[PDB]
Amino acid sequence: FADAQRSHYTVYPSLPQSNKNDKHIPFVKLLSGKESEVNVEKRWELYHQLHSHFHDQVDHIIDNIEADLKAEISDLLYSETTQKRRCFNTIFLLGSDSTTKIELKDESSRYNVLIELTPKESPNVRMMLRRSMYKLYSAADAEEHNDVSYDLSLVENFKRLFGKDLAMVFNFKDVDSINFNTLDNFIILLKSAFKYDHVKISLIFNINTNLSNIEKNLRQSTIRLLKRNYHKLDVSSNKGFKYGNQIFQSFLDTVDGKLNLSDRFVEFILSKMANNTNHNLQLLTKMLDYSLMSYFFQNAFSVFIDPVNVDFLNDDYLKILSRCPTFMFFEEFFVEFLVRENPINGHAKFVARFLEEELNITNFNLIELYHNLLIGKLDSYLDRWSACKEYKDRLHFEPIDTIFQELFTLDNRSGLLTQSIFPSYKSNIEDNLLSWEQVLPSLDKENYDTLSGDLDKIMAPVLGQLFKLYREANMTINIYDFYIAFRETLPKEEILNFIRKDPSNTKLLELAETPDAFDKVALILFMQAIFAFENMGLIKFQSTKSYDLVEKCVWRG
Amino acid sequence: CYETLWNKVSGERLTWAASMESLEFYFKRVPKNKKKTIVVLLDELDAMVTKSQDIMYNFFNWTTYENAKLIVIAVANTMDLPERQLGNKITSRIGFTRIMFTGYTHEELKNIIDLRLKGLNDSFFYVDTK
Amino acid sequence: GFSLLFYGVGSKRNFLEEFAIDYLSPKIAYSQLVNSIPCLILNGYNPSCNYRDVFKEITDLLVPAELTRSETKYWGNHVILQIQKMIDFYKNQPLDIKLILVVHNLDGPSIRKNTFQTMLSFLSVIRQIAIVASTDHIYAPLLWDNMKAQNYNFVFHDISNFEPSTVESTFQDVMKMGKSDTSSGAEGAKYVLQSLTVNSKKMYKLLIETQMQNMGNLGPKRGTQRTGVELKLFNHLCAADFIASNEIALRSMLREFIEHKMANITKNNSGMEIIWVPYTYAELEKLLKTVLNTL
DNA sequence: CAAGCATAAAAGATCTAAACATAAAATCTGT
DNA sequence: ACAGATTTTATGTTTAGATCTTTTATGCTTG
């Protein structure tokens, strides 16, 4: 068989028996493979220890967030409500990702059953009810250690069956995705469970957008019923700015003065953070980790972060660093300007703590503050609150005075950071396709050895050459005229000469003598290229019964 | 209809799959020396085929074996039921005698009615008015 | 923990396979320490790729623990629940890769649907497996929401070498430019059946002809189970034509067709086995009259 | 331009095959 | 070898996916 024609077929490669002691490392010797292996190993171990140090604090912050939100929602769930048992209390979690384990407190006289429902697991009202009753029965029987049909009467008979009171808490995982007709019908159905005087219900709506859509979609009577007890709770990772600050401070401490943050890098962090709110902290952690690993990867001097290896400077290191612009503008010379820790991080931490303890200001972005301090306009960020006017005297910061920060910094000047996490996907495709010269390297050393040393240079790759005309084409394109133009742009005699260049095959030379051999090989190339465009989505075809016209989908830029 | 046949030729009670394999093995491997001929009247074959197209093939193929001594008398409404259901190749590789019944004419129906009343037409009866 | 994606013009199938099979697996096997790490390569350009079979392979290779009865939930999807249980289990295992799941053409015809994308999204969170994928469509990033992009945790990389994609174009016709029946998958079946075996071709012709007869007995419709051919009936027909003598040979040679999705075997409601071809009647007739009929 | 004229695609009726599910009789396994 | 463990026949119950058919949102098109 042909394995390429298969699907999802496992392959067990035969690893060579040849092996070494410590050649197996992703890090490669920099400076044209001149650095020693000990430097690479030290870089690897320092990267691992620093990554562990950062991620431990990140995990602590994340766990703190989860614990705090769970405790707050559990406290709001009971809140010592004195309201009469004639309505069910509702909690709208504003903009909450459906990833939380709402814990229900154990009560001696009341079961507390968390029933979780999702849009995929709720096609209609009857299945909502059957799933809810099955979860209720299973949880109650597991807690308590014949059968009952799955309907609302299980709630009616609960006091008789298990000799205990009930408290069911409905957690709708994605309340925006469920079609609100069935959700409204299910709420109205649950309303019928208030004639028992031994069952209390609690609804939790994991809303993502706002309450405007809930008001618009739900029936007025249902909104009136919900309004008797509702609690708008705003739970989100992006609200209050009190959690991104902790992670950024953790990163700042895990780099300490050992590393420096470039102004453009923090500007990019802020820009990419401003464009996403539903999932913000994870994106920030990804960006920081990628920048850190890239900096330890493509920078050779990261082995010299700690002072102990400063003496390990060699002739190649000094020769390379001699071209540092800071050195031109300005062993023992380097260390006396390296061990000087940057006071910017300590000053920023002190300022943040000072404003967050007694100045009664909390809604601020530590990333924004750090970026502003890096620029140097800290007054322009501290004057917005209009409350630290008498405290600005002691909050002044001495301007940036540092040297040799190019070698120890986190920045994106080669564009890898932006093109590896948030690349301009379509724009990159069009940039690569329009200017194919910079994608395919041009070589002339071995053009004599190759069989096509005269045709490769003159012409262009078929797909990009077709894309040139396609961009220069009109909105609606006749296939015939497009092929005519493509063939006219195609050199005539050179194609025939290339065909004649192979004497091994016989069918090719047999077809070569045919007068329209060029006119049909060009057509074959055109069908191949148009198929590739259709697969890539550049072009589309209208009604296939006509198939004489095509429409351009994507435009360059 | 499989298991019934088995239950009527073997006295045992088997499920439909086991009955299929049992009947096939009895019609294929048991020698003609130790078998008794079976006549099966597959009445209303129209309802047996439906989506399955299995009953009719099994019953018209079990008669192909030389070991099997079976005379399957299938009866149906549509004359073209086999050639349509089994296919021309199968209905050709199985040679079965086809018979078509035409509705009675008026003379034939009159004869049927008259024959059914031969003992009562123009007869004397003693009747009591009480 | 970064799942890796390759995007750009040209075919990255050969390049990505060269990267994963020859370089990634031996190197990671050396670094973990012996045997090489298994490499599940998943052809996404095939419209016959099914997520059930992919997860069957992943659970045959990785062999995760079974899910308890309570964890099955009320009729919930077993694949996604098993994957979430796998995530819970693998959140504590040591962080060493035990599988690399190559995904060629992640934005293909049968691999772009939301179900398999959700499966891959939940599967990629597992640190112990590596998700290297390739994309071709311009609007491919449209397939991933915020949650799916987070779970993928992609690191986009540009690869553009203008390769002609010989393998990708195989599964679809080119004379009609591919505008019709692009996701049918019948062209790949024709290509694989062109030179497979004379006896396999003959029995496939018998099965196809029986399916057309059943369709005629029953407008272009799909070849569903109600129209398929019974396994016992097929064995009898093959024995009458000296193709496959017994059950064992027929099943052994039919497993090859089943694994390549040219045919499917299921069980009816009554328990009768059924073998059927999932191709459209017009596609079946074209396949019969273009390659089968030439003998 | 609208009407006419045509094909096309949305909304849903109608249905099936598959995944998920339970259960009673008969078979296959160890002491 | 006797009761438990597994299998085989036989349904019921939801989810995911299919094609037919009807209606109506698109184009084609003179002034």
Coordinates of N, CA and C in Angstrom, one line a residue, chain C residues 65-210:
Chain C
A65 N -6.3 5.3 31.0 CA -7.2 4.6 31.9 C -8.6 4.8 31.4
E66 N -9.5 3.8 31.7 CA -10.9 3.9 31.3 C -11.6 4.8 32.3
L67 N -12.7 5.4 31.8 CA -13.5 6.3 32.6 C -14.6 5.5 33.3
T68 N -14.8 5.9 34.6 CA -15.8 5.2 35.4 C -17.2 5.5 34.9
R69 N -18.1 4.7 35.5 CA -19.5 4.9 35.0 C -20.1 6.2 35.4
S70 N -19.7 6.8 36.5 CA -20.2 8.1 36.9 C -19.6 9.1 36.0
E71 N -18.4 9.0 35.6 CA -17.7 10.0 34.7 C -18.3 9.9 33.3
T72 N -19.0 8.9 32.9 CA -19.6 8.8 31.6 C -20.7 9.9 31.4
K73 N -21.4 10.3 32.5 CA -22.4 11.3 32.5 C -23.6 10.8 31.6
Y74 N -24.7 11.6 31.6 CA -25.9 11.2 30.9 C -25.7 11.4 29.4
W75 N -25.3 10.3 28.7 CA -25.2 10.2 27.2 C -24.1 11.2 26.7
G76 N -23.2 11.7 27.5 CA -22.2 12.6 27.0 C -21.2 11.9 26.1
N77 N -20.6 12.8 25.3 CA -19.6 12.3 24.3 C -18.5 11.6 25.1
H78 N -18.2 10.4 24.8 CA -17.1 9.6 25.4 C -15.7 10.1 25.1
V79 N -15.6 10.6 23.8 CA -14.2 11.0 23.4 C -13.8 12.2 24.2
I80 N -14.6 13.2 24.3 CA -14.2 14.5 25.0 C -14.1 14.2 26.5
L81 N -15.0 13.4 27.1 CA -14.8 13.1 28.5 C -13.6 12.3 28.8
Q82 N -13.2 11.4 27.9 CA -12.0 10.6 28.0 C -10.8 11.5 27.9
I83 N -10.9 12.5 27.0 CA -9.7 13.4 26.8 C -9.6 14.3 28.1
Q84 N -10.7 14.8 28.6 CA -10.6 15.6 29.9 C -10.1 14.8 31.0
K85 N -10.5 13.5 31.1 CA -9.9 12.6 32.1 C -8.4 12.4 31.9
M86 N -8.0 12.3 30.6 CA -6.6 12.2 30.3 C -5.8 13.5 30.7
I87 N -6.4 14.6 30.5 CA -5.8 15.9 31.0 C -5.6 15.9 32.5
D88 N -6.7 15.5 33.2 CA -6.6 15.4 34.7 C -5.5 14.4 35.1
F89 N -5.4 13.3 34.4 CA -4.3 12.3 34.8 C -2.9 12.8 34.5
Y90 N -2.8 13.5 33.3 CA -1.5 13.9 32.8 C -1.0 15.2 33.5
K91 N -1.9 15.9 34.2 CA -1.4 17.1 35.0 C -0.4 16.7 36.1
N92 N -0.3 15.5 36.4 CA 0.7 15.1 37.5 C 1.8 14.2 37.0
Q93 N 1.7 13.6 35.8 CA 2.8 12.8 35.3 C 4.0 13.6 35.0
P94 N 5.2 13.0 35.0 CA 6.4 13.8 34.6 C 6.3 14.3 33.1
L95 N 6.9 15.5 32.9 CA 6.7 16.2 31.6 C 7.8 15.7 30.6
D96 N 7.5 14.5 30.2 CA 8.3 13.9 29.1 C 7.4 13.4 28.0
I97 N 7.7 13.8 26.7 CA 6.8 13.5 25.6 C 6.8 12.0 25.4
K98 N 5.5 11.5 25.2 CA 5.3 10.0 24.9 C 4.7 9.8 23.6
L99 N 4.4 10.9 22.8 CA 3.8 10.8 21.5 C 3.9 12.1 20.8
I100 N 4.1 12.1 19.5 CA 4.0 13.3 18.7 C 2.9 13.1 17.7
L101 N 1.9 14.0 17.6 CA 0.8 13.8 16.8 C 0.9 14.8 15.6
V102 N 1.6 14.4 14.6 CA 1.7 15.2 13.4 C 0.3 15.3 12.8
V103 N -0.1 16.5 12.3 CA -1.4 16.8 11.8 C -1.1 17.5 10.4
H104 N -1.0 16.8 9.3 CA -0.9 17.4 8.0 C -2.2 18.1 7.6
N105 N -2.1 19.3 7.1 CA -3.2 20.0 6.5 C -4.3 20.1 7.6
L106 N -4.0 20.8 8.6 CA -5.0 21.0 9.8 C -6.3 21.6 9.3
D107 N -6.3 22.3 8.2 CA -7.5 23.0 7.7 C -8.0 22.4 6.5
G108 N -8.0 21.1 6.4 CA -8.5 20.3 5.3 C -10.0 20.1 5.3
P109 N -10.5 19.2 4.4 CA -12.0 19.1 4.3 C -12.7 18.5 5.5
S110 N -12.2 17.4 5.9 CA -12.9 16.6 7.0 C -12.2 16.9 8.4
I111 N -11.2 17.7 8.4 CA -10.4 18.0 9.6 C -10.7 19.4 10.2
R112 N -11.4 20.2 9.4 CA -11.8 21.6 9.8 C -13.1 21.6 10.6
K113 N -13.9 20.6 10.6 CA -15.1 20.6 11.3 C -15.0 20.7 12.8
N114 N -16.0 21.3 13.4 CA -15.8 21.8 14.8 C -15.5 20.6 15.8
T115 N -16.1 19.4 15.5 CA -15.9 18.3 16.4 C -14.5 17.9 16.5
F116 N -13.8 17.6 15.4 CA -12.5 17.2 15.5 C -11.5 18.3 15.9
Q117 N -11.8 19.5 15.6 CA -11.0 20.6 16.1 C -11.2 20.7 17.6
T118 N -12.4 20.5 18.2 CA -12.5 20.5 19.6 C -11.7 19.4 20.2
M119 N -11.8 18.2 19.6 CA -11.0 17.1 20.1 C -9.5 17.5 20.1
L120 N -9.0 18.0 19.1 CA -7.5 18.4 19.0 C -7.2 19.5 20.0
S121 N -8.2 20.4 20.2 CA -8.0 21.5 21.2 C -7.8 20.9 22.6
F122 N -8.7 20.0 23.0 CA -8.5 19.4 24.3 C -7.3 18.5 24.4
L123 N -7.0 17.9 23.3 CA -5.9 16.9 23.3 C -4.5 17.6 23.4
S124 N -4.4 18.8 22.8 CA -3.1 19.5 22.8 C -2.7 20.1 24.1
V125 N -3.7 20.2 25.1 CA -3.3 20.7 26.4 C -2.4 19.7 27.1
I126 N -2.6 18.4 26.8 CA -1.7 17.4 27.4 C -0.3 17.7 27.0
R127 N 0.6 17.9 28.0 CA 2.0 18.3 27.8 C 2.7 17.1 27.2
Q128 N 2.3 15.8 27.6 CA 3.0 14.6 27.2 C 2.9 14.3 25.7
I129 N 2.1 15.0 25.0 CA 2.0 14.8 23.5 C 2.3 16.1 22.9
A130 N 2.9 16.0 21.7 CA 3.3 17.2 20.9 C 2.5 17.3 19.7
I131 N 1.9 18.5 19.4 CA 1.0 18.7 18.3 C 1.7 19.6 17.4
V132 N 2.3 19.1 16.3 CA 2.8 19.8 15.2 C 1.9 19.7 14.0
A133 N 1.5 20.8 13.5 CA 0.4 20.9 12.5 C 0.8 21.8 11.3
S134 N 0.1 21.7 10.2 CA 0.3 22.5 9.0 C -1.0 23.0 8.5
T135 N -1.0 24.3 8.1 CA -2.2 24.9 7.5 C -1.9 25.5 6.1
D136 N -2.9 25.5 5.3 CA -2.8 26.0 3.9 C -3.8 27.1 3.6
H137 N -5.0 27.1 4.1 CA -6.1 28.1 3.8 C -5.7 29.4 4.3
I138 N -6.1 30.5 3.6 CA -5.9 31.8 4.1 C -6.6 32.2 5.3
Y139 N -7.9 31.8 5.4 CA -8.8 32.0 6.5 C -8.7 30.9 7.5
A140 N -7.7 30.1 7.6 CA -7.5 29.0 8.5 C -7.7 29.5 10.0
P141 N -7.1 30.6 10.4 CA -7.3 31.1 11.8 C -8.7 31.4 12.2
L142 N -9.6 31.4 11.2 CA -11.0 31.6 11.5 C -11.6 30.4 12.3
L143 N -10.9 29.3 12.2 CA -11.4 28.0 12.8 C -11.3 28.0 14.3
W144 N -10.5 28.9 14.9 CA -10.2 28.8 16.3 C -10.7 30.0 17.1
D145 N -11.5 29.7 18.1 CA -12.1 30.7 19.0 C -11.0 31.2 20.0
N146 N -11.4 31.9 21.0 CA -10.4 32.3 22.1 C -10.0 31.0 22.8
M147 N -11.0 30.2 23.2 CA -10.7 29.0 24.0 C -9.8 28.0 23.2
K148 N -10.2 27.8 22.0 CA -9.4 26.8 21.1 C -8.0 27.3 20.8
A149 N -7.9 28.6 20.6 CA -6.5 29.2 20.4 C -5.7 29.0 21.7
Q150 N -6.3 29.2 22.9 CA -5.6 29.1 24.1 C -5.2 27.6 24.3
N151 N -6.1 26.7 24.0 CA -5.8 25.3 24.3 C -4.7 24.8 23.3
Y152 N -4.8 25.1 22.0 CA -3.8 24.9 21.1 C -2.4 25.5 21.5
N153 N -2.5 26.7 22.0 CA -1.3 27.4 22.4 C -0.2 27.5 21.3
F154 N -0.7 27.9 20.1 CA 0.2 27.8 18.9 C 1.3 28.8 19.0
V155 N 2.4 28.4 18.2 CA 3.5 29.3 17.9 C 3.7 29.2 16.4
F156 N 3.1 30.2 15.7 CA 3.1 30.1 14.2 C 4.5 30.2 13.7
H157 N 4.8 29.4 12.7 CA 6.1 29.5 12.0 C 5.9 29.4 10.5
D158 N 6.6 30.3 9.8 CA 6.5 30.5 8.3 C 7.4 29.5 7.6
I159 N 6.8 28.6 6.8 CA 7.5 27.8 5.9 C 6.9 27.9 4.5
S160 N 7.7 28.4 3.5 CA 7.2 28.6 2.2 C 8.3 28.1 1.2
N161 N 8.1 27.0 0.5 CA 9.1 26.5 -0.4 C 8.5 26.2 -1.8
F162 N 7.2 26.5 -2.0 CA 6.6 26.4 -3.4 C 6.6 25.0 -3.9
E163 N 6.5 24.0 -3.0 CA 6.5 22.6 -3.4 C 5.1 22.4 -4.1
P164 N 5.1 21.4 -5.1 CA 3.9 21.3 -6.0 C 2.8 20.5 -5.4
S165 N 2.9 19.9 -4.2 CA 1.8 19.2 -3.5 C 1.3 18.1 -4.4
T166 N 2.1 17.1 -4.8 CA 1.7 16.0 -5.5 C 0.7 15.1 -4.7
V167 N 1.0 14.9 -3.5 CA 0.2 14.0 -2.6 C -1.2 14.6 -2.4
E168 N -1.2 15.9 -2.1 CA -2.4 16.6 -1.7 C -3.4 16.5 -2.9
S169 N -3.0 16.8 -4.1 CA -3.9 16.8 -5.2 C -4.4 15.4 -5.6
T170 N -3.8 14.3 -5.0 CA -4.1 13.0 -5.4 C -5.6 12.6 -5.1
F171 N -6.1 13.1 -4.0 CA -7.4 12.7 -3.5 C -8.5 13.3 -4.2
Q172 N -8.3 14.3 -5.1 CA -9.4 14.9 -5.8 C -9.0 15.0 -7.3
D173 N -10.1 15.1 -8.1 CA -9.9 15.2 -9.5 C -9.3 16.5 -10.0
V174 N -8.6 16.5 -11.1 CA -8.0 17.7 -11.7 C -8.5 18.0 -13.1
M175 N -9.1 17.1 -13.8 CA -9.7 17.4 -15.1 C -10.8 18.3 -15.0
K176 N -11.7 18.1 -14.0 CA -12.8 19.0 -13.7 C -12.4 20.1 -12.7
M177 N -11.1 20.3 -12.5 CA -10.5 21.3 -11.7 C -10.8 21.1 -10.2
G178 N -11.5 20.1 -9.8 CA -11.9 19.9 -8.5 C -13.1 20.6 -8.0
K179 N -13.8 21.3 -8.9 CA -15.0 22.1 -8.5 C -16.1 21.2 -8.1
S180 N -16.2 20.0 -8.5 CA -17.3 19.1 -8.1 C -16.8 17.9 -7.4
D181 N -17.5 17.5 -6.3 CA -17.2 16.3 -5.5 C -15.8 16.4 -4.9
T182 N -15.5 17.6 -4.4 CA -14.2 17.9 -3.9 C -14.0 17.1 -2.6
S183 N -15.0 17.0 -1.7 CA -14.9 16.3 -0.5 C -15.5 14.9 -0.6
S184 N -15.8 14.4 -1.8 CA -16.4 13.1 -2.0 C -15.4 12.0 -1.5
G185 N -14.2 12.1 -1.8 CA -13.2 11.1 -1.5 C -13.2 9.9 -2.5
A186 N -14.0 9.9 -3.5 CA -14.0 8.8 -4.5 C -12.8 8.8 -5.4
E187 N -12.2 10.0 -5.6 CA -11.0 10.0 -6.5 C -9.8 9.3 -5.8
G188 N -9.6 9.5 -4.5 CA -8.6 8.8 -3.7 C -8.9 7.3 -3.8
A189 N -10.1 6.9 -3.7 CA -10.5 5.4 -3.8 C -10.1 4.9 -5.2
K190 N -10.4 5.7 -6.3 CA -10.0 5.3 -7.6 C -8.5 5.2 -7.7
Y191 N -7.7 6.1 -7.2 CA -6.3 6.1 -7.3 C -5.7 4.9 -6.5
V192 N -6.2 4.6 -5.3 CA -5.7 3.4 -4.6 C -6.1 2.1 -5.2
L193 N -7.3 2.1 -5.9 CA -7.8 0.8 -6.5 C -7.2 0.6 -7.9
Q194 N -6.6 1.6 -8.5 CA -6.1 1.5 -9.9 C -5.2 0.3 -10.0
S195 N -4.2 0.2 -9.1 CA -3.2 -0.9 -9.1 C -3.1 -1.4 -7.6
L196 N -4.1 -2.3 -7.2 CA -4.0 -2.9 -5.9 C -3.9 -4.4 -5.9
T197 N -4.8 -5.1 -6.6 CA -4.8 -6.6 -6.8 C -5.9 -6.9 -7.7
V198 N -5.7 -8.0 -8.5 CA -6.8 -8.4 -9.4 C -8.0 -9.0 -8.7
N199 N -7.7 -9.8 -7.7 CA -8.8 -10.5 -7.0 C -9.5 -9.5 -6.1
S200 N -8.8 -8.6 -5.5 CA -9.4 -7.5 -4.7 C -10.3 -6.6 -5.6
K201 N -9.8 -6.3 -6.8 CA -10.6 -5.5 -7.7 C -11.9 -6.3 -8.1
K202 N -11.7 -7.6 -8.4 CA -12.9 -8.4 -8.8 C -13.9 -8.4 -7.7
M203 N -13.5 -8.7 -6.4 CA -14.5 -8.7 -5.4 C -15.1 -7.4 -5.1
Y204 N -14.3 -6.3 -5.2 CA -14.8 -5.0 -5.1 C -15.9 -4.7 -6.2
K205 N -15.6 -5.2 -7.4 CA -16.6 -5.0 -8.4 C -17.9 -5.8 -8.1
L206 N -17.8 -7.0 -7.5 CA -19.0 -7.7 -7.1 C -19.7 -7.0 -6.0
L207 N -19.0 -6.4 -5.0 CA -19.7 -5.7 -4.0 C -20.4 -4.4 -4.5
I208 N -19.7 -3.7 -5.4 CA -20.3 -2.5 -6.0 C -21.5 -2.8 -6.8
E209 N -21.5 -3.9 -7.6 CA -22.6 -4.3 -8.4 C -23.8 -4.7 -7.6
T210 N -23.5 -5.4 -6.5 CA -24.6 -5.8 -5.6 C -25.2 -4.6 -4.9

